[PDB]
Amino acid sequence: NKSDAAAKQIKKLEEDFDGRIGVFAIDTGSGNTFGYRSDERFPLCSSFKGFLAAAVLERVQQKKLDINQKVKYESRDLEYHSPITTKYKGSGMTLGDMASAALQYSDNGATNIIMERFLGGPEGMTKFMRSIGDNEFRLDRWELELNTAIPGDKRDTSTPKAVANSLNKLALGNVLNAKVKAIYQNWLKGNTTGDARIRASVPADWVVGDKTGSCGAYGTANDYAVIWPKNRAPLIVSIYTTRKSKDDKHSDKTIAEASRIAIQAID
Numbered sequence: 001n002k003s004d005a006a007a008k009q010i011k012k013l014e015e016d017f018d019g020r021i022g023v024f025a026i027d028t029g030s031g032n033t034f035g036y037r038s039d040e041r042f043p044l045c046s047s048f049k050g051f052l053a054a055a056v057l058e059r060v061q062q063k064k065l066d067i068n069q070k071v072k073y074e075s076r077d078l079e080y081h082s083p084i085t086t087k088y089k090g091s092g093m094t095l096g097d098m099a100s101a102a103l104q105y106s107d108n109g110a111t112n113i114i115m116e117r118f119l120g121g122p123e124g125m126t127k128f129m130r131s132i133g134d135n136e137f138r139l140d141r142w143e144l145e146l147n148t149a150i151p152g153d154k155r156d157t158s159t160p161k162a163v164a165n166s167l168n169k170l171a172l173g174n175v176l177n178a179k180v181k182a183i184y185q186n187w188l189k190g191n192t193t194g195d196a197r198i199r200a201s202v203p204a205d206w207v208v209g210d211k212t213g214s215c216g217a218y219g220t221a222n223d224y225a226v227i228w229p230k231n232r233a234p235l236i237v238s239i240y241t242t243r244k245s246k247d248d249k250h251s252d253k254t255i256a257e258a259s260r261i262a263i264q265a266i267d
């Protein structure tokens, strides 16, 4: 009835904003979990970029790639929302810097370049996720078409549970070795776009790594995080939202509140 009470709370919250909220949370110290609509499908939006970064680091680890190799794209027509890659179009970027821009700034050019050259496209991204035991994740399209968030569309979706389980494996588990993992954790911690989402649901002095998504259609937006409370094992939180009408705007406050409720549920 802790879990029952939190379910009712998320249900009211999703009704209050005429939308749908999916949650999965884990306390890695007790093993307690909480889920609401945790097996239902929600658009990934840019949230997959967090996993794209992990896939890059795994290639470096397999010695298929060098973290400091220069990636040049001087002639490319860069995607909308390429703030970092545009700045370095002239000089190029290291792969590592390009991967962390994709994560930390949600950079679309970084994303597509990496998928084109190193990861084997949406199909390759999906393969990477299957390789770590994630059978829900699917990436079907490239940026920016993957953000359409059409009601009923299963392209470019996962479930709140699969996302949480995967971030657990990547950030805290053993897919990456201890050196490579440390880099990945530092990339998540440095994320710039999540101040009003999961980070807003915990104390400022806790350490948080996260990746957001904002589709910009159908009120669809999300966030996942690893949270290190002071003197406590880490928490994993995965929050996904959609809303009913195309023109609806996402709700950062709803995401933060759902995180608060999920965190209470496992405590």
Ligand SMILES: *[B@@]1([O])OC2=C(C([O])=O)[C]=[C][C]=C2[C][C]1[N]C(=O)[C][C]1[C][C][C]([N][C][C][N])[C][C]1
Binding pocket: 045, 046, 047, 080, 081, 106, 108, 144, 147, 193, 211, 212, 213, 214, 215, 216
């Ligand atoms: B994406 O899903 O992630 C992303 C975020 C985020 O992660 O929350 C912020 C800014 C851009 C992006 C890129 C990806 N999304 C898009 O390309 C569409 C997005 C949605 C509408 C816009 N909102 C900014 C002010 N309204 C920005 C583009």
